[PDB]
Design a protein around this nucleic acid. Structure first.
Length: 118
RNA sequence: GCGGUGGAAACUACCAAGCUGGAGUACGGUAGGGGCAGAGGGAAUUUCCGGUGGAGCGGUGAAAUGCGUAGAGAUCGGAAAGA
């Protein structure tokens, strides 16, 4: 089990080739995580909006032991996995308070690597 | 062409004396990522230290090497580091 409080943050690591749908409490002990590599298929298929939908659905379908009402989602990063994930959470329709972005916006910190030339 | 000699004085040069628009300086402002030195800053990244949780994470045209049950990645806190 857990603390049994039905409010908790959801983080969506939407990568450029993957998604991770994790869900955790206010302190930060994770109650479940499920990614595109978690839900079966793996390779070039993972990181597509069907993987965001299935990974989000298989992520938050297992919080029915909690039955969280007051949801709040804190996504991160670029990729094709955001909008399908928000349509998945709104499909489950639980009390999504506010979604938000927490993406790392650097202030010219490190040099990003070589351009691809492909 | 060179030399001697007699004349001219506009121009270059010369002698002397003024002139100011050229150029500077004095003064008052004024704008500036001009330079150098000293302090201070916060994102981000990486690594380490803790709590969670458990199988992938990462990557690609598609894969693979890598890393991961010695608990990775993700998440929250704690430091430190250089750029």
């Amino acid at each position: 089990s857990a603390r049994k409080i039905p409010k908790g943050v959801i983080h969506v690591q939407a990568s450029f080739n993957n998604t991770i749908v994790t869900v955790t409490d206010v302190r930060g002990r994770v109650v479940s995580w499920a990614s595109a590599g978690t839900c079966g298929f793996r390779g070039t298929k993972r990181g597509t909006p069907f993987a965001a939908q299935t990974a989000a659905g298989n992520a938050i379908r297992t919080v029915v032991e909690q039955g969280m009402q007051r949801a709040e989602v804190m996504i991160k990063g670029p990729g094709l996995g955001r909008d399908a994930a928000l349509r998945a959470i709104r499909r489950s329709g639980i009390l999504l308070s506010f979604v938000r972005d927490v993406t790392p916006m650097p202030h010219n910190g490190c040099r990003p690597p070589k351009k691809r030339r492909v």
